[PDB]
Coordinates of C-alpha atoms and ligand atoms in Angstrom, one line a residue:
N1 CA -13.9 16.1 30.3
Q2 CA -15.3 12.9 28.3
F3 CA -10.6 12.9 27.4
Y4 CA -7.9 12.0 28.6
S5 CA -4.0 13.2 27.9
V6 CA -1.6 10.0 27.8
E7 CA 2.5 11.3 26.4
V8 CA 4.1 7.8 23.7
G9 CA 6.5 9.4 23.7
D10 CA 6.7 13.5 23.1
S11 CA 3.5 12.9 21.5
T12 CA 0.3 13.6 23.9
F13 CA -3.0 10.9 22.9
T14 CA -5.0 12.9 24.0
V15 CA -8.8 10.5 23.4
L16 CA -11.7 9.3 24.5
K17 CA -11.8 7.8 28.1
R18 CA -13.2 4.3 26.6
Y19 CA -9.6 3.6 25.0
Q20 CA -7.5 1.8 27.2
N21 CA -3.6 1.0 27.9
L22 CA -2.5 2.6 25.3
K23 CA 1.1 1.4 23.6
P24 CA 2.9 2.2 20.0
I25 CA 2.9 -0.3 17.4
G26 CA 4.2 2.5 14.0
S27 CA 4.7 5.7 12.6
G28 CA 6.0 5.7 8.6
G29 CA 1.9 10.6 11.9
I30 CA 2.1 8.6 15.0
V31 CA -0.2 5.3 15.9
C32 CA -1.0 3.0 18.6
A33 CA -2.9 -0.3 20.2
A34 CA -5.4 0.2 22.7
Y35 CA -8.1 -1.7 24.5
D36 CA -11.6 0.1 23.9
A37 CA -13.9 -0.8 26.7
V38 CA -17.0 -0.2 25.1
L39 CA -16.9 -2.3 22.8
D40 CA -14.5 -4.7 24.2
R41 CA -12.0 -6.3 21.9
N42 CA -8.1 -4.2 20.5
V43 CA -8.5 -1.6 18.0
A44 CA -5.4 0.5 16.9
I45 CA -5.1 4.2 17.0
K46 CA -4.0 6.3 15.0
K47 CA -3.1 10.2 15.4
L48 CA -2.5 13.3 12.4
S49 CA -1.3 16.1 13.7
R50 CA -2.3 19.7 12.5
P51 CA -3.1 17.3 9.3
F52 CA -3.7 20.6 7.6
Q53 CA -0.2 22.4 7.5
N54 CA -0.7 22.8 4.6
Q55 CA -2.1 21.5 0.7
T56 CA -0.2 18.1 0.4
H57 CA -1.3 16.5 4.5
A58 CA -4.6 18.2 3.6
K59 CA -5.5 17.7 0.5
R60 CA -4.8 13.6 1.8
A61 CA -5.2 14.0 5.5
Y62 CA -10.1 14.9 3.3
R63 CA -9.9 12.2 1.4
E64 CA -8.9 9.6 3.6
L65 CA -11.1 10.2 6.0
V66 CA -14.3 11.1 3.3
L67 CA -12.8 7.3 1.3
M68 CA -12.0 5.0 4.6
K69 CA -15.8 5.9 5.6
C70 CA -17.3 5.9 2.4
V71 CA -15.6 2.1 1.2
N72 CA -16.6 -0.8 2.2
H73 CA -14.2 -4.0 2.3
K74 CA -12.9 -7.3 4.2
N75 CA -9.8 -6.5 2.8
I76 CA -9.7 -2.6 3.2
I77 CA -9.3 -0.6 5.9
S78 CA -12.7 0.9 8.1
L79 CA -12.9 3.8 10.8
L80 CA -14.5 2.0 13.5
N81 CA -14.7 6.3 14.6
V82 CA -13.2 9.4 14.1
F83 CA -13.3 12.6 16.8
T84 CA -11.4 15.8 17.4
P85 CA -10.3 16.6 20.8
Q86 CA -11.0 20.1 20.4
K87 CA -14.6 21.4 21.3
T88 CA -14.6 24.7 18.8
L89 CA -13.0 25.0 14.9
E90 CA -11.0 28.0 16.4
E91 CA -8.8 25.5 19.4
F92 CA -9.4 22.4 16.0
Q93 CA -6.0 20.6 16.0
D94 CA -5.7 17.4 15.9
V95 CA -7.7 14.1 14.3
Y96 CA -7.5 10.5 15.1
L97 CA -8.6 6.9 13.6
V98 CA -9.2 4.3 14.7
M99 CA -9.5 0.9 13.8
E100 CA -10.2 -3.0 14.5
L101 CA -6.5 -3.6 15.7
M102 CA -4.6 -6.0 12.7
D103 CA -1.1 -7.4 14.8
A104 CA 2.1 -6.9 12.0
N105 CA 3.2 -5.2 9.1
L106 CA 3.6 -7.0 5.7
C107 CA 7.3 -5.3 5.3
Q108 CA 7.6 -7.9 8.8
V109 CA 6.4 -10.9 6.9
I110 CA 8.3 -10.3 3.5
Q111 CA 11.4 -11.3 6.5
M112 CA 9.8 -15.1 7.1
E113 CA 10.0 -17.7 4.8
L114 CA 6.4 -18.1 3.2
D115 CA 4.5 -21.9 2.2
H116 CA 2.2 -21.1 -0.9
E117 CA -0.1 -21.6 1.0
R118 CA -0.2 -18.4 3.3
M119 CA 1.9 -16.0 0.0
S120 CA -0.6 -16.7 -2.2
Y121 CA -3.4 -16.1 0.4
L122 CA -1.7 -13.0 0.7
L123 CA -1.2 -12.4 -3.3
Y124 CA -5.3 -12.7 -3.6
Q125 CA -6.3 -10.4 -0.9
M126 CA -4.2 -8.0 -2.0
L127 CA -5.9 -8.3 -5.4
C128 CA -9.6 -7.8 -4.1
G129 CA -8.3 -5.3 -2.3
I130 CA -7.8 -3.4 -5.3
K131 CA -10.3 -5.3 -7.7
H132 CA -12.1 -3.5 -5.2
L133 CA -11.4 0.3 -5.6
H134 CA -10.6 0.1 -8.5
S135 CA -14.2 -0.4 -8.9
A136 CA -15.0 2.1 -6.6
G137 CA -12.5 4.8 -9.2
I138 CA -9.5 4.3 -7.3
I139 CA -6.5 3.2 -9.0
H140 CA -5.0 3.5 -5.6
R141 CA -0.5 3.2 -7.4
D142 CA 1.4 3.7 -4.1
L143 CA 1.0 0.4 -2.6
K144 CA 3.9 -0.6 -0.5
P145 CA 4.7 -3.2 2.6
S146 CA 4.6 -0.8 5.2
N147 CA 1.0 1.3 4.4
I148 CA -0.2 -2.6 4.3
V149 CA -1.2 -4.2 7.7
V150 CA -2.3 -8.0 8.9
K151 CA -4.4 -10.5 11.4
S152 CA -2.5 -13.8 13.1
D153 CA -4.6 -15.5 10.5
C154 CA -3.2 -14.5 7.4
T155 CA -5.9 -11.5 6.8
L156 CA -4.8 -8.8 5.5
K157 CA -6.1 -5.4 5.0
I158 CA -5.0 -1.7 2.3
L159 CA -4.2 1.0 4.7
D160 CA -4.6 3.7 2.5
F161 CA -6.3 5.5 -0.8
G162 CA -3.0 6.8 -3.0
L163 CA -1.9 9.5 -4.8
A164 CA -4.8 11.1 -6.4
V165 CA 9.0 8.2 1.2
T166 CA 9.0 4.9 -1.0
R167 CA 9.6 4.6 -4.0
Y168 CA 10.4 1.3 -5.0
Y169 CA 7.0 -0.3 -5.3
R170 CA 6.1 1.9 -8.1
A171 CA 5.3 0.8 -11.5
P172 CA 6.8 2.8 -14.8
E173 CA 4.5 4.6 -15.9
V174 CA 4.8 6.5 -12.3
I175 CA 8.4 6.4 -12.2
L176 CA 7.7 8.1 -15.5
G177 CA 4.6 9.7 -15.7
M178 CA 3.4 8.7 -18.4
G179 CA -0.3 7.9 -17.9
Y180 CA -2.2 4.8 -16.2
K181 CA -4.4 2.0 -16.7
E182 CA -5.9 -0.1 -12.8
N183 CA -3.0 -2.4 -13.9
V184 CA -0.3 0.6 -12.7
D185 CA -1.2 -1.5 -9.5
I186 CA -0.5 -4.7 -10.4
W187 CA 3.2 -3.9 -10.8
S188 CA 3.4 -3.3 -7.6
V189 CA 2.0 -6.9 -6.1
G190 CA 4.5 -8.5 -8.5
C191 CA 7.8 -5.9 -6.2
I192 CA 6.0 -7.2 -3.1
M193 CA 5.6 -10.7 -4.5
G194 CA 8.9 -11.1 -5.8
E195 CA 10.1 -9.2 -2.5
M196 CA 8.9 -11.9 -0.9
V197 CA 10.1 -14.4 -2.3
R198 CA 14.1 -13.0 -2.7
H199 CA 14.0 -11.3 0.2
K200 CA 15.3 -7.6 -1.0
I201 CA 14.1 -4.6 -2.3
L202 CA 13.6 -5.9 -6.2
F203 CA 14.2 -1.8 -7.4
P204 CA 16.6 0.1 -4.9
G205 CA 17.6 2.9 -5.7
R206 CA 18.6 7.0 -3.8
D207 CA 15.6 8.4 -6.8
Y208 CA 13.9 7.5 -10.1
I209 CA 17.7 7.5 -11.7
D210 CA 18.6 4.7 -9.4
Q211 CA 15.7 3.1 -9.4
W212 CA 14.5 3.0 -13.7
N213 CA 18.7 1.8 -13.8
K214 CA 17.9 -1.7 -11.6
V215 CA 14.4 -2.1 -13.8
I216 CA 16.2 -2.1 -16.6
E217 CA 18.7 -4.8 -16.1
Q218 CA 16.5 -7.8 -14.5
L219 CA 13.6 -7.2 -17.0
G220 CA 15.8 -5.8 -19.6
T221 CA 15.0 -2.6 -22.1
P222 CA 11.4 -2.0 -22.9
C223 CA 10.0 -3.0 -26.8
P224 CA 10.0 -0.1 -29.1
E225 CA 5.5 0.3 -29.5
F226 CA 6.2 1.2 -25.7
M227 CA 8.9 4.2 -26.5
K228 CA 6.9 5.5 -29.4
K229 CA 4.4 5.9 -26.1
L230 CA 6.3 7.8 -23.8
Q231 CA 6.4 11.8 -24.3
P232 CA 9.4 13.6 -25.7
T233 CA 12.0 14.3 -22.8
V234 CA 10.9 10.9 -21.4
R235 CA 11.6 9.4 -24.0
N236 CA 14.5 10.6 -24.6
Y237 CA 16.3 9.5 -21.4
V238 CA 15.0 6.0 -21.4
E239 CA 16.3 4.8 -25.5
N240 CA 19.6 7.1 -24.1
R241 CA 20.9 4.7 -20.7
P242 CA 23.1 2.0 -21.9
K243 CA 20.0 -0.8 -23.5
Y244 CA 20.4 -3.9 -21.4
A245 CA 19.4 -7.7 -22.5
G246 CA 17.1 -8.4 -19.2
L247 CA 17.3 -11.8 -17.3
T248 CA 15.0 -14.3 -17.8
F249 CA 12.5 -15.1 -14.3
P250 CA 13.9 -18.4 -13.6
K251 CA 16.9 -16.6 -13.1
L252 CA 15.7 -14.1 -11.4
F253 CA 13.8 -16.2 -9.3
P254 CA 15.8 -19.5 -8.9
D255 CA 14.7 -22.6 -7.9
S256 CA 16.4 -22.1 -5.0
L257 CA 14.8 -19.8 -3.6
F258 CA 11.5 -22.0 -3.1
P259 CA 10.2 -24.8 -2.1
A260 CA 11.5 -28.4 -3.2
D261 CA 10.5 -31.2 -1.0
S262 CA 8.1 -32.1 -3.0
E263 CA 5.8 -31.9 -6.1
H264 CA 2.9 -29.4 -4.8
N265 CA 5.6 -26.7 -3.9
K266 CA 7.5 -27.3 -7.1
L267 CA 3.7 -27.0 -9.0
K268 CA 3.3 -24.2 -7.1
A269 CA 6.9 -23.4 -7.6
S270 CA 6.1 -23.2 -11.3
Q271 CA 3.2 -21.3 -11.1
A272 CA 4.9 -19.1 -8.6
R273 CA 7.2 -17.6 -11.4
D274 CA 5.1 -17.4 -13.9
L275 CA 2.6 -15.1 -12.3
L276 CA 5.0 -13.2 -11.0
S277 CA 6.5 -13.0 -15.2
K278 CA 3.0 -11.1 -16.2
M279 CA 3.2 -8.5 -13.0
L280 CA 7.2 -7.4 -13.6
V281 CA 6.2 -6.1 -16.8
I282 CA 6.7 -2.8 -17.6
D283 CA 4.6 -2.0 -20.7
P284 CA 0.7 -1.6 -19.1
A285 CA -0.1 -3.0 -22.4
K286 CA 1.7 -6.6 -22.1
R287 CA 1.3 -6.3 -17.9
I288 CA -1.4 -9.0 -16.4
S289 CA -4.6 -7.0 -15.6
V290 CA -6.3 -7.4 -12.5
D291 CA -9.1 -10.1 -12.9
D292 CA -7.1 -12.1 -14.5
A293 CA -4.3 -12.4 -11.9
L294 CA -7.8 -13.5 -9.5
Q295 CA -7.3 -16.0 -12.0
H296 CA -4.0 -16.9 -12.2
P297 CA -3.9 -21.2 -10.9
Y298 CA -1.4 -19.6 -8.4
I299 CA -3.9 -17.5 -7.3
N300 CA -7.4 -18.8 -7.8
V301 CA -7.6 -21.8 -5.5
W302 CA -8.5 -19.3 -3.2
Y303 CA -11.6 -18.0 -4.8
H304 CA -8.5 24.7 -0.8
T305 CA -6.2 27.0 1.9
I306 CA -4.8 26.2 5.2
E307 CA -7.6 27.7 6.6
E308 CA -10.4 26.5 4.7
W309 CA -10.0 22.6 4.2
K310 CA -9.7 23.2 8.7
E311 CA -13.0 23.4 7.6
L312 CA -13.3 20.9 5.5
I313 CA -12.2 18.1 7.8
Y314 CA -13.9 19.5 10.7
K315 CA -17.2 19.1 9.0
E316 CA -15.7 15.6 8.2
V317 CA -14.9 14.5 11.2
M318 CA -18.0 16.7 13.3
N319 CA -20.4 13.9 10.9
Ligands
738_1 N1 -4.0 -1.9 13.0 C1 -2.9 -1.4 12.6 C2 -1.8 -0.5 12.1 C3 -1.7 0.6 11.7 N2 -2.5 1.3 11.7 C4 -2.7 2.3 10.5 O1 -2.1 3.5 10.6 C5 -4.3 2.5 10.2 C6 -4.5 3.9 9.6 C7 -5.4 4.1 9.2 C8 -6.4 4.8 9.9 C9 -5.9 3.9 11.6 C10 -5.3 3.8 11.9 F1 -4.4 2.7 13.1 S1 -0.3 1.4 11.5 C11 0.9 -0.5 11.7 C12 -0.1 -1.1 13.0 C13 0.0 -2.6 13.0 C14 0.9 -2.8 13.3 C15 2.5 -2.1 11.8 C16 2.0 -0.9 12.0

């Protein structure tokens, strides 16, 4: 037997003997930290439970399985290993994904007071990864702090590959479903950046109705040429919400929320606030591109059926 089993709270992790001393570290299914005897270093292990239980799970599991192996960048997860304990296609039940062990989630980092030095290096790293995915034909469209991990030395990796549930970081074009470009991902990075400053979710809501409301109060009702690109029915809903004027960015992010103890930090606040207002733009036509955000002075400092899916996945776990 090359495997063994151990409980981590009703979740049985049956894993290769190389992986030792399991300990839970997250569930946004189930993920463990472990020592890997062969590599003499620490790894994270995530177990997909019967990832082929429906079209949804199976389509994502399969796509993420393929790409994670297929895509190669320092700011994007990669697998050190993939395995299933089950020996046959018939008995096949679970997939385990193994990655280099990271120390924290982005939720955790946003809770800290952070300097511009670390906040800007984290943003720089999201743009690089997001940049990379785009160059590969992957527009993510679902960036959030929970699918982004961090090491103590502030190196950052994106954990998943997007759409092909936390909704706060989704762009207007996703909230309204209207067809998107690469810079749909820039909205999300703008939401993340803002939360880092404000320490509250920029656009919360029970659903997309409340959500869009939060967007228009703070940013104001968008201009006419933006509306002209919304389909008849959604366009009607948008134009008919009470129209707001929309706070400016100094009001949205008062100096209070920035270090003002030196000139460096004063300049850095100004630049930060300037980038937030290019990212947090409702109309994609007028929202900043990834390549440009990487140029910003705040940033540039760092330059088909349950049966069928089962088999498709299995092959890929075999491979
Ligand atoms: N490393 C790491 C890590 C997580 N990893 C994963 O979710 C994961 C995703 C895909 C493949 C493997 C894997 F461990 S989840 C999580 C962490 C670090 C602590 C916060 C929660």
